[PDB]
From Swiss-Prot, chain C:
It comes from Saccharomyces cerevisiae (strain ATCC 204508 / S288c) (Baker's yeast). It is found in: Cytoplasm; Nucleus. The alpha and beta forms are probably products of the same gene with different post-translational modifications. Belongs to the peptidase T1A family. Present with 12000 molecules/cell in log phase SD medium. GO terms for molecular function: mRNA binding. GO terms for cellular component: nucleus; proteasome complex; proteasome core complex, alpha-subunit complex; proteasome storage granule. The proteasome degrades poly-ubiquitinated proteins in the cytoplasm and in the nucleus. It is essential for the regulated turnover of proteins and for the removal of misfolded proteins. The proteasome is a multicatalytic proteinase complex that is characterized by its ability to cleave peptides with Arg, Phe, Tyr, Leu, and Glu adjacent to the leaving group at neutral or slightly basic pH. It has an ATP-dependent proteolytic activity. The keyword Cytoplasm applies. This is Probable proteasome subunit alpha type-7. The chain holds residues 8 to 246 of 288 of the full protein. One of its GO terms (biological process) is proteasome-mediated ubiquitin-dependent protein catabolic process. The keyword Acetylation applies. The gene is PRE10.
Curated annotation (Swiss-Prot), chain E:
The proteasome degrades poly-ubiquitinated proteins in the cytoplasm and in the nucleus. It is essential for the regulated turnover of proteins and for the removal of misfolded proteins. The proteasome is a multicatalytic proteinase complex that is characterized by its ability to cleave peptides with Arg, Phe, Tyr, Leu, and Glu adjacent to the leaving group at neutral or slightly basic pH. It has an ATP-dependent proteolytic activity. Its main location: cytoplasm. The chain holds residues 1 to 163 of 258 of the full protein. Disulfide bonds: none annotated. One of its GO terms (biological process) is proteasome-mediated ubiquitin-dependent protein catabolic process. Belongs to the peptidase T1A family. The gene is PRE9. There is a cross-link at K70 (Glycyl lysine isopeptide (Lys-Gly) (interchain with G-Cter in ubiquitin)). Keywords: Cytoplasm, Isopeptide bond, Nucleus, Proteasome, Ubl conjugation. Present with 17100 molecules/cell in log phase SD medium. This is Proteasome subunit alpha type-3.
Swiss-Prot record, chain H:
There is a cross-link at K188 (Glycyl lysine isopeptide (Lys-Gly) (interchain with G-Cter in ubiquitin)). It is found in: Cytoplasm; Nucleus. The keyword Cytoplasm applies. Transmembrane segments: none annotated. Present with 7210 molecules/cell in log phase SD medium. The gene is PRE5. This is Proteasome subunit alpha type-6. The proteasome degrades poly-ubiquitinated proteins in the cytoplasm and in the nucleus. It is essential for the regulated turnover of proteins and for the removal of misfolded proteins. The proteasome is a multicatalytic proteinase complex that is characterized by its ability to cleave peptides with Arg, Phe, Tyr, Leu, and Glu adjacent to the leaving group at neutral or slightly basic pH. It has an ATP-dependent proteolytic activity. It comes from Saccharomyces cerevisiae (strain ATCC 204508 / S288c). InterPro entries: Ntn_hydrolases_N, Proteasome_alpha, Proteasome_alpha-type, Proteasome_asu_N, Proteasome_sua/b. Keywords: Cytoplasm, Isopeptide bond, Nucleus, Phosphoprotein, Proteasome, Ubl conjugation. GO terms for biological process: proteasomal ubiquitin-independent protein catabolic process; proteasome-mediated ubiquitin-dependent protein catabolic process.
Curated annotation (Swiss-Prot), chain I:
Keywords: Cytoplasm, Hydrolase, Nucleus, Protease, Proteasome, Threonine protease, Zymogen. One of its GO terms (biological process) is proteasomal ubiquitin-independent protein catabolic process. It catalyses: Cleavage of peptide bonds with very broad specificity. The proteasome degrades poly-ubiquitinated proteins in the cytoplasm and in the nucleus. It is essential for the regulated turnover of proteins and for the removal of misfolded proteins. The proteasome is a multicatalytic proteinase complex that is characterized by its ability to cleave peptides with Arg, Phe, Tyr, Leu, and Glu adjacent to the leaving group at neutral or slightly basic pH. It has an ATP-dependent proteolytic activity. The 26S proteasome consists of a 20S proteasome core and two 19S regulatory subunits. The 20S proteasome core is composed of 28 subunits that are arranged in four stacked rings, resulting in a barrel-shaped structure. The two end rings are each formed by seven alpha subunits, and the two central rings are each formed by seven beta subunits. The catalytic chamber with the active sites is on the inside of the barrel. Its EC number is 3.4.25.1. It comes from Saccharomyces cerevisiae (strain ATCC 204508 / S288c). This is Proteasome subunit beta type-2. The keyword Nucleus applies. The side chain of Thr-1 acts as a nucleophile, and the N-terminal amino group acts as a proton acceptor. The keyword Cell membrane does not apply.
């Protein structure tokens, strides 16, 4: 419902909320919208849950085969696999997917795949129903070559605004940092971003 | 035609399977030993022709993250078996949600070899496969499969022409006392020393290829990482 | 035991593959040299002067970065190149990146090995030398009718393969630090001219191609023009 | 790459014999002596185990398998064929009987299915008969305890006490020498152990033989199944009182 | 050299006009025992040779009889079932490339049109009614 | 819906050591009666199956289950049991997941081994409802439920069970427009099976 | 396929005495939301072909991948793949039209309007149109979608018939194209201020101008409008 | 030979004897000569009859308005190959609106011929072909063998007693290449070349066929009285 | 229908109601909604009863085959993947909503699956028509430090609340407790707070009341 990915200076941070609603009722108050595809190169998905889970499983299997047979996949390879899966089933699935990854050569890459199967790189990406309320703010407060803490603060502010102004979005704020050091998981509770 | 297709001879034998077994022997010897929490495989990298690129001449394949395989026999059938094993492991992980155990993959490859030996339109593969891993429920594990569809697990194993000497030395060592070393480097050095005892030729860093299966993952050792054990063995 | 494709001999050999290798032995000389960046050279027998010069190209291009030469039954090599083009196109469609040279070599090896598993087909009667440049650098590979392939610093096959192998070994020993691109082209021309001596009483045409970083932008291009004439003159001088 | 092996590889000889089936029987005969004894409260299946190499772990390979919680099997002949046939029988026991009627198939019907599978290999195209002879031990509510033998020809026969392998004749003679009407499960186990010890050339311990029993009930193993494969320690304890 | 292992081309004629496989199967049956299954409530069959193929054919006959009963709501006549089984056995003697069945069948059946009848059939596919064995 | 075109009523009750299954006899096209001799209770060995709904589907299910029962008896050389037949009916109904038969099948009988009475009901797609008191199907299921919730006592004698089930069936049919035209009651005991016809108004 | 999700905007093109000019903006609208910017909708094929695509952009990427594959295929076993056996605008347009018609006949169309522009090997300017349903036609001036209603009337004021083509210089055509783009930005709610322009000339060749911006706009008079009465 | 029952068997020296028999089937056919210049390409064919009461079999088949061929060997295989070439040319003209190049047709025929020499259950073709064409790169002449080998030459000859025509073409190579302004002169050169292969035979209006293609010249066949002035 | 699942420190508990209805009429008042997929893996289902039962039986048969093939204990993740793939293959036409819970060598697991194949994890889950009351009770009385008895009381409370406050639920409460290292899970109607009162008058007819035409 509120999904984001930003590449600052040393890697990529992907952030999301944790609210899953089956209508006006909250079906899952704390859901993990961040799914691992490989060790690196993994981000969050929006839209229908079943389609996104199936696409994520298929992409994970395909990239496992790619790693076993031809070396190590890049972020663009995962973006292409997602694009093919979304485009060939254009009339069958409604997912919407952002893919974020890290590698030594490029040091952080993001790809956006909306409904219809198109793919765009962009320096930062926002998606979901709540992101509609943060289009201006994210445009007014994004800079290239930021530090990790500044990126965490920017994601926290944007996701807090999205949670506040969207009914179907917002539990806790989950963040994943992918850099050369490794993969780091962060969680921010409502008492933090609401104040 | 009992000697040309996989049909029974009057005495009840399959000659094509035996011929594939003969074809399993270039004459590279390989060894596999399991320790406390790791498994080590070593193979001979014989490249007498200087035109070949040494890094591309290998008989060890990383099937999955935790499983490694060493093949004895011609390399085309080895690559065929490696690709099949990789596909089966990936399919198992996708379908069942957890990593394929080493013995399960060995059983699947044995079933495929049996199917090859059962149909008259498919010849048996002339290779011998050894799968090594650290299974999450069984610890270190070594399983060998042959062109006859047979497969079984080993405390330690050796494949090649003069495998009898290595097997005799290993069984004598086990009668004396797995390996009680908690670090895989010690197990690698022990395997190298045992191979030197059985096949004495003073292996250099370019005459060996080593794969190590630990709990986290399976990997292989480069020539620079290979020459450190023999220096350590010599300095002891 | 030499009548079917997928029958093991009592000693474990496949005689059909060996006969395919014998068929390869009758082919013309084709060589490939890898430099630091790669270079492919082929000899075309001029059976008669009626043939139009520079109209029977034998070196083939896969994608925009793979170059392939073959010795043996030319139609078999063309069929293998078509299959390789299909596989490269499928890989590029599925992953959006040009297929790495080791992956292409593995695909070709799997295809050739599958062509030795049944008696309804026969093994390919060609040996292929193919290479190029990818993100990991410059690669050269040699594939045989049995399906086994290896990477080489220098490779050669055909009637005059032994002299070419000796020259390649001498060049490798004399250049422990590698070769440039133009020097590699000149050496390939010289080796082709020296290996042509297995026929002598037959005119021949030299065809050279290269694919390296710089001077070709990582793509495969045929050596044509003043450079080819300089290479021919250098080969004739030696 | 086409199969083009549609014709059958097993045909009749001028004397009326099927050569491939006879050769499969010959391959079976040069195997390992496996025996089965039916009692009033169970059925015992015993076999000998060989060591391919001293370094090989014998417990990684089991020569007796559980087909259903109440039906088990043993083989004499080619091991990989037995393993593939066990997998096929396990699949058939579910995809043909249990998924329709909600119950595990009776022993006779499962033996019929296995015999049909083995017969399909002697008449279809581009195949060879399985080089194994199977002993099936089972229990069902209406038929009681049953023991069957299935040959490579696909013909199955019910037996009260049978044996196959190299020492099949001597083991059969020993079993038929004294077979009473009051045999118990432990009496059957003792007789099987004695016959296996007589047939074997030595090294008769708990780690060189494999035994399984069908009977009674094991709710402790439910998590009950009537199939119990005895552990090595229990076999050693029983041999200490032999 | 796709597959030259065809076992004497089972479904061909001899130079004298005979079928070798059928005669060999008849020899195999004659070398078997001397002649117990229920096809339905009114028909029984005795088998000779290759009990597995006999069981397969008996299952097929049971399926055919039950199909006839479902279709017509009447018990199948003995002759129809015997003819169907004989045609099934003859089919393998003319096409398919497989070996013929090695089973001889003796059917005893009662219908409402003939009042107790007996038949016999062989691998050649020819069935004959007999007053007594 | 096809289940309310031909009409029908089937009920089943349990007794001390016996069961009872009763059904109506009316068969009509919508509001026009056609036949008054259309029994809806069939027998397979010692089990009884009462089907309500579309008459063609009832006949098709009867023929298919007779086929399956004959093949099962031939293969296993024994009569089917009510629980095994219930599982078979459920599986067969679920086989037509997207093309289900518009039927109201009900299974009753006494197990040969245990001797326990057994009654079960099914929906159109094969969901087993194993109830120890009674099972109801037809176009007047609510009336049968109201009649059977009261008037029913556990472990009733067959003589009293007959009266109870007959009164319930008659009073349920009298308030249903698409059921009637006579009634048939089976009292199933240990290899006894007594069949009776009831007297009722012809609407 | 059945409905476009991310859609492009008008593509305009015209012929001048020595070649063709084709321009298109760089917007990736998502309905009423201008979601994506910097999307190139002019695909150069060879040194003599430009393909302009309007409509669904996922299908645009699909057919540009098809064009890349076609370019790769044309070079196979073709020693003259860059001199005389190279691809031409006519061949590319025929392939695209065949693909579009085949997609239409299967009720699975590519939601695009495509303009193919270039110079033929004999010096003749090629400029043709295709879309879904496989409808094809040619004209001295072409425009897709919204620009078909506003850009065409202006361009036809300069090149009205065939005989006007030899009388039009490249400067006049480029000025007309820029003015048409400014008008489209004035009156189209799905338009963007930035656009790309390609010129194909028989003599000079292919000239590509990216990151162009609409300028010299008029807004001063808006200070004098107040209320609605 | 034990290695001759099928095409999927290699000889111990690495030979395919079925392909060799297919090649020998060509040697038992009539002689056909092909030549070309910068502007035109010409095929000359000598036809045969069963007897005096039968007609002469056609030896030249048109594939497209810019490409044609002449056959030597099994006529039905030539018909199959010509139909395949017509289909390929039509596909190229429809999908891309481009005239198919002669080299592309050569590659297609090479691939199709190869596909019949490697799979069990089939046989190689038994006809040799001389294909002429004109395209954007000029005039082209190609020689096709059933083994899949396709060659490009200024002139060639196939069939029986073809060595005389080939020797004449080799000797006069420097002459017929420059014949561009006169198609009839090139036709005369081809006729004189094929005359060297005649074994006590005379060219008549009944056994001579002449096909020509050129720059401003659709593929045109002359037979019967059309070849009266070329004799 | 109400189904709840609560994960305590070293195991899971699954509880359910026992009422199955068609429309506004109660079909069966003692339906069993706890399904045994594996001796240590149990699932409960809501929605179409036939679809849930068939899917559970098929997945259980496949799980048993897998356990026989691998000579290993079945895992909850395997059943989860099989169920979700099977449900997704039918695009939600198989209307089953499942709560799966089990104990395996990797620990204790609890998941929820929807009819379209989507899955989720949690420490306490509720499904069915009356799932909102059970969810409110769980949110009111859940803590991360739970023992076996506290969990078995929480599940009963949630099921009882869902029974009382939803017209689609009623009758008794079925419980199933899975703990690491032991079987248990044999509750079978722990609570039965819907006992019907005795009827005011007996309605046993005297013999001979019904008229019989023929026998």
């Amino acid at each position: 419902t509120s999904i984001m990915a930003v590449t600052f200076k040393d890697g990529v941070i992907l952030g999301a909320d944790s609210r899953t609603t089956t209508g006006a009722y909250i079906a899952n108050r704390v859901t993990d919208k961040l799914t691992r595809v490989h060790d690196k190169i993994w981000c969050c998905r929006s839209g229908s849950a079943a389609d996104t889970q199936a696409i994520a499983d298929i992409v994970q299997y395909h990239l496992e085969l790619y790693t076993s047979q031809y070396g190590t996949p890049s972020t663009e390879t995962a973006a292409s696999v997602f694009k093919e899966l979304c485009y060939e089933n254009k009339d069958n699935l409604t997912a919407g997917i952002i893919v974020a990854g890290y590698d030594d050569k490029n040091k952080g890459e993001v790809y956006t795949i909306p409904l219809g199967g198109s793919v765009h790189k962009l320096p930062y990406a926002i998606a979901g129903s709540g992101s509609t309320f943060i289009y201006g703010y994210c445009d007014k407060n994004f800079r290239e070559n930021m530090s990790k803490e500044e990126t965490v603060d920017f994601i926290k502010h944007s996701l807090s605004q999205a949670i506040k102004w969207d009914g179907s979005s917002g539990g806790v704020i989950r963040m994943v940092v992918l850099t050369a050091a490794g993969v780091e998981r962060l969680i921010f509770y409502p008492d933090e971003y609401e104040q | 035609y009992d000697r040309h297709i996989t049909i029974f001879s009057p005495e009840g034998r399959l000659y094509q399977v035996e011929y594939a077994f003969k074809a399993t022997n270039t004459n590279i010897n390989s060894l596999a030993v399991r320790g406390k929490d790791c498994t080590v495989v070593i193979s001979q990298k014989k490249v007498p022709d200087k035109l070949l690129d040494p890094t591309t001449v290998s008989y060890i394949f990383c099937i999955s993250r935790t499983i490694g395989m060493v093949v004895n026999g011609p390399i085309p059938d080895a690559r065929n078996a490696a690709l099949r094993a990789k596909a089966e492991a990936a399919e198992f992980r996708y379908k069942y949600g957890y990593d394929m155990p080493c013995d399960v993959l060995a059983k699947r490859m044995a079933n495929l070899s049996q199917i090859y030996t059962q149909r008259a339109y498919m010849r048996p593969l002339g290779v011998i496969l050894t799968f090594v891993s650290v299974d999450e429920e069984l610890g270190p594990s070594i399983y060998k499969t042959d062109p006859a569809g047979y497969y079984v697990g080993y405390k330690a194993t050796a494949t090649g022409p003069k495998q009898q000497e290595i097997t005799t030395n290993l069984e004598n060592h086990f009668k004396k006392s797995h390996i009680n070393e908690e670090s895989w480097e010690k197990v690698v050095e022990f395997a190298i020393t045992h191979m030197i005892d059985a096949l004495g030729t003073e292996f250099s860093k370019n005459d060996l290829e080593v794969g190590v299966a630990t709990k986290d993952k399976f990997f292989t050792l480069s020539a620079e990482n290979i020459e450190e054990r023999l220096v350590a063995i010599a300095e002891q | 035991y030499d009548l079917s494709n997928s029958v093991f001999s009592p000693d474990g050999r496949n005689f059909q593959v060996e006969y395919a290798v014998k068929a390869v032995e009758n082919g013309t000389t084709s060589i490939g040299i890898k430099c630091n960046d790669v270079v492919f050279a082929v000899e075309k027998l001029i059976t008669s002067k009626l043939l139009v010069p520079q109209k029977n190209v034998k070196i083939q291009v896969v994608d925009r970065h793979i170059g392939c030469v073959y010795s043996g039954l030319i139609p078999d090599g063309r069929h293998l190149v078509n299959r390789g083009r299909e596989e490269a196109a499928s890989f590029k469609k599925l992953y959006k990146t040009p297929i790495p040279i080791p992956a292409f070599a593995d695909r070709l090896g799997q295809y050739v090995q599958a062509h030795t598993l049944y008696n309804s087909v026969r093994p390919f009667g060609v040996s292929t030398i193919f290479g190029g440049v990818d993100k990991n650098g410059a690669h050269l590979y040699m594939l045989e009718p049995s399906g086994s392939y290896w990477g080489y610093k220098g490779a050669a096959t055909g009637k005059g393969r032994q002299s070419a192998k000796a020259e390649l070994e001498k060049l490798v020993d004399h250049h422990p630090e590698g070769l440039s691109a133009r020097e590699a082209v000149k050496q390939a021309a010289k080796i082709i001219y020296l290996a042509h001596e297995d026929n002598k009483e037959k005119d021949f045409e030299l065809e050279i191609s290269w694919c390296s970083l710089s001077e070709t932008n990582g793509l495969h291009k045929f050596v044509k023009g003043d450079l080819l004439q300089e290479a021919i003159d250098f080969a004739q001088k030696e | 790459m086409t199969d083009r092996y549609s014709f059958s590889l097993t045909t009749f000889s001028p004397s009326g014999k099927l050569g491939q089936i006879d050769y499969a029987l010959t391959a079976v005969k040069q195997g390992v002596t496996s025996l089965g004894i039916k009692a009033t409260n169970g059925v015992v299946i015993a076999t000998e185990k060989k060591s391919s190499s001293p370094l090989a772990m014998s417990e990684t390979l089991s020569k007796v398998s559980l087909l259903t919680p109440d039906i088990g099997a043993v083989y004499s002949g080619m091991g990989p064929d037995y393993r593939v046939l066990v997998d096929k029988s396990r699949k058939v026991a579910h995809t043909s009987y249990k998924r329709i009627y909600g119950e595990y198939p009776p022993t006779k019907l499962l033996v019929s299915e296995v015999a049909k599978i083995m017969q399909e290999a002697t008449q279809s195209g581009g195949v060879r008969p399985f080089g194994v002879s199977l002993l099936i031990a089972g229990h069902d509510e209406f038929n009681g305890f049953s023991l069957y033998q299935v040959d490579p020809s696909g013909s199955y026969f019910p037996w009260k006490a049978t044996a196959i392998g190299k020492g099949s004749v001597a083991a059969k003679t020993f079993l038929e020498k004294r077979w009473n009407d009051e045999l118990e499960l432990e009496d059957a186990i003792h007789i099987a152990l004695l016959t296996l010890k007589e047939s074997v050339e030595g090294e008769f311990n708990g780690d060189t033989i494999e035994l399984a029993i069908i009977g009674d009930e094991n709710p402790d193993l439910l998590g009950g199944p009537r199939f119990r494969k005895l552990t090595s320690q229990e076999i050693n304890d029983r041999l200490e009182a032999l | 050299m796709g597959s030259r292992r065809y076992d004497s081309r089972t479904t061909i004629f001899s130079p004298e006009g005979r079928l070798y496989q059928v005669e060999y199967a008849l020899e195999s049956i004659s070398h078997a025992g001397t002649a117990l299954y229920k096809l339905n409530d009114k028909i029984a069959v005795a088998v000779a040779g290759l009990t597995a193929d006999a069981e397969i054919l008996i299952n097929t006959a049971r399926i055919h009889a039950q199909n006839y009963l479902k279709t017509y709501n009447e018990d199948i006549p003995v002759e129809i079932l015997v003819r169907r089984l004989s045609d099934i056995k003859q089919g393998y003697t003319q096409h398919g490339g497989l070996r013929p069945f090695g089973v001889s069948f003796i059917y005893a059946g009662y219908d409402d049109r003939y009042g107790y009848q007996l038949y016999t059939s062989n691998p050649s596919g020819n069935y004959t009614g007999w007053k007594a064995i | 819906d096809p289940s309310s075109i031909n009409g029908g009523i089937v009920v089943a009750m349990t007794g001390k050591d016996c069961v009872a299954i009763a059904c109506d006899l009316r068969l009509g096209s919508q509001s026009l009666g056609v036949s008054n001799k259309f029994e809806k209770i069939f027998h397979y060995g010692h089990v009884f199956l009462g089907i309500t709904g579309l008459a063609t589907d009832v006949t098709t299910l009867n023929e298919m289950f007779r086929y399956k029962t004959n093949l099962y008896k031939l293969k296993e050389e024994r009569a089917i049991e009510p629980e095994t037949f219930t599982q078979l009916v459920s599986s067969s109904l679920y086989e037509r997941r997207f093309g289900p038969y518009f039927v109201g099948p009900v299974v009753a009988g006494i197990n040969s081994k245990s001797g326990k009475p057994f009654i079960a009901g099914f929906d159109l797609i094969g969901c087993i409802d194993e109830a120890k008191d009674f099972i109801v199907s037809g176009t007047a299921s609510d009336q049968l439920f109201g009649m059977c919730e009261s008037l029913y006592e556990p472990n009733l004698e067959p003589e009293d069970l007959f009266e109870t089930i007959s009164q319930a069936l008659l009073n349920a049919a009298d308030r249903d427009a698409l059921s009637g035209w006579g009634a048939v009651v089976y009292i199933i005991k240990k290899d006894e099976v007594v069949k009776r016809y009831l007297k009722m108004r012809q609407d | 396929t059945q409905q476009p999700i991310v859609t492009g905007t008008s593509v305009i093109s015209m012929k001048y005495d020595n070649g063709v000019i084709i321009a298109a903006d760089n917007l990736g609208s998502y309905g009423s939301l201008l979601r994506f910017n910097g999307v190139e909708r002019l695909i150069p094929v060879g040194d003599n072909t430009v393909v302009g695509i309007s409509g669904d952009i996922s299908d645009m990427q699909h057919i540009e991948r098809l064009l890349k594959d076609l370019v790769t295929e044309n070079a196979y076993d073709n020693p003259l793949a860059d001199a005389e056996e190279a691809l031409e605008p006519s061949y590319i347009f025929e392939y695209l039209a065949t693909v579009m018609y085949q997609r239409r006949s299967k009720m699975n169309p590519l939601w695009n309007a495509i303009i193919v522009a270039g110079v033929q090997s004999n010096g003749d300017q090629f400029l043709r149109y295709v879309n879904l349903l496989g409808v094809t036609y040619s004209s001295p001036t072409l425009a897709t979608g919204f620009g078909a209603h506003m850009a065409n009337p202006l361009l036809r004021k300069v090149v009205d018939r065939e005989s006007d083509i030899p009388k039009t210089t490249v400067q006049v055509a480029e000025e007309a194209i820029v003015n048409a783009m400014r008008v489209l930005y004035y009156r189209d709610a799905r338009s963007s201020r930035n656009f790309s322009l390609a010129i194909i000339d028989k003599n000079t060749g292919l000239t590509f101008k990216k990151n162009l911006q609409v300028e010299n706009m008029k807004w001063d008079f808006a200070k004098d409008i107040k209320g609605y009465g | 030979n034990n290695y001759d029952g099928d095409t999927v068997t290699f000889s111990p020296t690495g030979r395919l004897f079925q392909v060799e028999y297919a090649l020998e089937a060509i040697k038992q056919g009539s002689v056909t000569v092909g030549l070309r210049s910068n502007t035109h390409a010409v095929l000359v064919a000598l036809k045969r009859n069963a007897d005096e009461l039968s007609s002469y079999q056609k030896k030249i088949i048109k594939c497209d308005e810019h490409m044609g061929l002449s056959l030597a060997g099994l006529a039905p295989d030539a018909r199959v190959l010509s139909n395949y070439l017509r289909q390929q040319c039509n596909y190229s003209s429809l999908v891309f609106n481009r005239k198919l190049a002669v080299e592309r047709a050569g590659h297609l025929l090479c691939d199709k011929a190869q596909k019949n020499t490697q799979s069990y259950g089939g046989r190689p073709y038994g006809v040799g072909l001389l294909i002429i064409g004109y395209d954007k790169s000029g005039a082209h002449l190609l020689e096709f063998q059933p083994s899949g080998n396709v060659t490009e030459l200024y002139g060639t000859a196939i069939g029986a007693r073809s060595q005389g025509a080939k020797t004449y073409l080799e000797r006069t190579l420097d002459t017929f290449i420059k014949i561009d302004g006169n198609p009839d002169e090139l036709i005369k050169a081809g006729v004189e070349a094929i005359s060297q292969s005649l074994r006590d035979e005379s060219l008549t209006v009944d056994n001579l066929s002449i096909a020509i293609v050129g720059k401003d010249t659709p593929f045109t066949i002359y037979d019967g009285e059309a070849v009266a002035k070329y004799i | 229908t109400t189904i709840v699942g609560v994960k305590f420190n070293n195991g899971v508990v699954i509880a359910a109601d026992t009422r199955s209805t068609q429309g506004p009429i109660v079909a069966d008042k003692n339906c069993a909604k706890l399904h045994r997929i594996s001796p240590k893996i149990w699932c409960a289902g809501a929605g179409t009863a036939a679809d849930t039962e068939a899917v559970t039986q098929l997945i259980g048969s496949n799980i048993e085959l897998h356990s026989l093939y691998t000579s290993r204990e079945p895992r909850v993740v395997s059943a989860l993947q099989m169920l979700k793939q099977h449900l997704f293959k039918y695009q939600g036409h198989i209307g089953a909503y499942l709560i799966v819970a089990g104990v395996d060598p990797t620990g204790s697991h609890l998941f929820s699956i929807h009819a379209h194949g989507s899955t989720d994890v949690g420490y306490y889950l509720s499904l069915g028509s009356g799932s909102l009351a059970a969810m409110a009770v769980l949110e009111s009385h859940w803590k991360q430090d739970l023992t076996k008895e506290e969990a078995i009381k929480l599940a009963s409370d949630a099921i009882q609340a869902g029974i009382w406050n939803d017209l689609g639920s009623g009758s008794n409460v079925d419980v199933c407790v899975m703990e690491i290292g032991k079987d248990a899970e044999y509750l079978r109607n722990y609570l039965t707070p819907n006992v019907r009162e005795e009827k005011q008058k007996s309605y046993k007819f005297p013999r001979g009341t019904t008229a019989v035409l023929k026998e």
